[PDB]
Assembly symmetry: C3
Homo-oligomer: 159 residues x 3
């Protein structure tokens, strides 16, 4: 590749994690680290999986990389409160179309968050009137001890 | 002919706006993006600055999933009958070596008020810089909430 | 000279610059805009990052950025329309002893003094390194405080750039 070819991300990786922290940002950083995406820069995106992009396990990312990432997170300082974050990726039957990435966060269980985010993806496809192939999702819940963060993401990268 | 153009700074800006009801805030937001014509690309929220010599152009054909540097304003409301608006403006300088200022606004007001407000914000930015104004281009959108709606306005940066 | 970090994903910033500023404004966005200008980073496109300084990146005074530049920036800001209210924003960059490791960028803003904001953000950076169990070389930080007259914004950032 003697000449860098412009391209849209072609991989999407679903990760999720949670962590306690002394401050909201430290808990967030902890959640990222727990999710396996803690030493890279997350560039928040509105969430669209580029056509022909493949869902793959999180690639080995260069530290400090500017990773276009669709994510949802929630931080709580209420002891005993269970918080969750979930990400869904609606995949089209028509491969020339894009996938839809939805995120959800709330004071609920992992199961509810995942169900809600998957439903949101479905709704997005209905709004577009696109044929839905399937929905891939991930979710995580965290029971706050003192200060915790639940985080779920779809990291877009290049294979 | 310039190569690696996409690896350089965006040279176009497109003002788009839209609104939509949604079963959830994000679904409403997604609907507004779709209604605005940029629902199938990735919006990368930016602080809002039109690169010098860039041109305001109608929304180009964007590749789905594109990482579009976008300055935007949006408002979501679940209050039936409430009118919410979003507007975007870009102040273009007379001195073409200078950058354009992109301002975004949102609120519980009419399309007219949102646009007037966002235009003044762009003008003020130029006043703060002491830059001579060529013109201010803007667009606004209002949405009367039925159950849960989102009004959205954006300045999408892209390439020639 | 021009670069879109979102497209040139393979080209990571190799410098980081701490800037801070504050400003009054007729609207929250105008105040925010005024703060960027006061911080010296007012005519560029800020792409917010989560806050990781790429390994081997050097802390340098903010370079002359071309207008409209897409600048990956870790930042914190606070806007207030309460007269007399003192607001602050601070940024810290924890630098590792092992240069092959990344630096951690923490941001903090609140209704407090410049001194408190900086102390807090510095502690946050220290905590980040302790959570990783990495050897901390030092913490570079900056803070700014603004006493709101009508509507003000305090802004602090770690702008990632190239050299």
């Amino acid at each position: 590749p003697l000449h860098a070819y412009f391209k849209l991300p072609n991989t999407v990786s679903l990760v999720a994690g949670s962590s306690e922290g002394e401050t909201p940002l430290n808990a967030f950083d902890g959640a990222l680290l727990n999710a396996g995406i803690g030493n890279v820069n997350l560039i928040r995106i509105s969430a669209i999986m580029p056509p022909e992009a493949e869902i793959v396990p999180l690639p080995k990312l260069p530290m400090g990389a500017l990773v276009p990432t669709a994510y949802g997170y929630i931080i709580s300082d209420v002891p005993g409160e269970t918080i969750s974050a979930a990400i869904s990726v609606a995949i089209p039957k028509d491969k020339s179309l894009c996938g839809l990435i939805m995120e959800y966060e709330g004071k609920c269980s992992k199961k509810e968050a995942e169900k809600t985010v998957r439903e949101m993806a479905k709704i997005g496809f209905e709004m577009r009137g696109w044929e839905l192939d399937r929905i891939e999702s991930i979710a995580v819940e965290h029971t706050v001890e003192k200060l915790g963060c639940a985080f779920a993401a779809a990291a877009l990268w290049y294979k």
